[PDB]
Design a protein around this ligand. Structure first.
Ligand code: 0Z0
Ligand code: CA
Length: 240
């Protein structure tokens, strides 16, 4: 997250860190959202490499014991049937991960609340992006969970020529674009939490930013619109 502030330890308890094994250690690569005790929602491009993955729930400082972490292996990966690595601009950047075991819920580990199918937010709706991604374009990962206020930019404005044009689809949410605050590499797969009827719900899975930089004026951060995928999510969990 570029232009973020450090998040309190229990503010966003459905946030997970998706990590892959490198050498002996494990390295953070993407965020995700816990949606069942044994299921995580993330971006399909985070699991395009055939790496050994683990999930960390209750995490706050990547590089330090918080006393609240639970470490679980990824047992099955289900990416969207239509996802195509060579075309993120087509959409379908979503994947569900079955965990090797059920995590224990407590105040640091909670299920994310998903929107109703079909729900579209009005322009400039209040949302926060969270994650441990790069804090500057071409910078480095954050050690502690970051958050940034990233109001929605509706489809009509985001698909206009000065913004993303044809690259953004209606299966996506755009948020930000002020040149200051944005998601950045390592935030992918994570939540866009939006306040709807006094409740934060996860309306976006972080997908992409401009080739030109993370915080680029009129290039909002782009998210997979979770409410476009509610029937697919439920059909996957129901069968696995
Ligand atoms: C450097 C920048 N990286 C990104 O946008 C990558 C995630 C990504 C990359 C490729 C595919 C899907 C998702 N993510 C990030 O930096 C994020 F965490 F903010 F999301 C980038 O290249 N973005 C980008 C790439 C291609 C397109 C195209 F789809 F229009 F072709 C649009 C934006
Ligand atoms: Ca830690």
């Amino acid at each position: 997250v570029v232009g973020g502030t450090e998040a309190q330890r229990n503010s966003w308890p459905s946030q997970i860190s998706l990590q892959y094994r490198s050498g002996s250690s494990w390295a953070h690569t993407c965020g995700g959202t816990l949606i069942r005790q044994n299921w995580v929602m993330t971006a399909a491009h985070c699991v395009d490499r055939e790496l050994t993955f683990r999930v960390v729930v209750g995490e706050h400082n990547l590089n330090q014991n918080n006393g609240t972490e639970q470490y679980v292996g990824v047992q099955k990966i289900v990416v969207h049937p239509y996802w195509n690595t060579d075309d993120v601009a087509a959409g379908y950047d979503i994947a569900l991960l079955r965990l090797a075991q059920s995590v224990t819920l407590n105040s640091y580990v909670q299920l994310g609340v998903l929107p109703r199918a079909g729900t579209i937010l009005a322009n400039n709706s209040p949302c926060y992006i969270t994650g441990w991604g790069l804090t500057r374009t071409n910078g480095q990962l954050a050690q502690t969970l970051q958050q940034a206020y990233l109001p929605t930019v509706d489809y009509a404005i985001c698909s206009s020529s000065s913004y993303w044009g044809s690259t953004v689809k209606n299966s996506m949410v755009c948020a930000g674009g002020d040149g200051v605050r944005s998601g950045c590499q390592g935030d992918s797969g994570g939540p866009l939490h939006c306040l709807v009827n006094g409740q934060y719900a996860v309306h976006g899975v972080t997908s992409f930013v401009s080739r030109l930089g993370c915080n680029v004026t009129r290039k909002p951060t782009v998210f997979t619109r979770v409410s476009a995928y509610i029937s697919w999510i439920n059909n996957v969990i129901a069968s696995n």
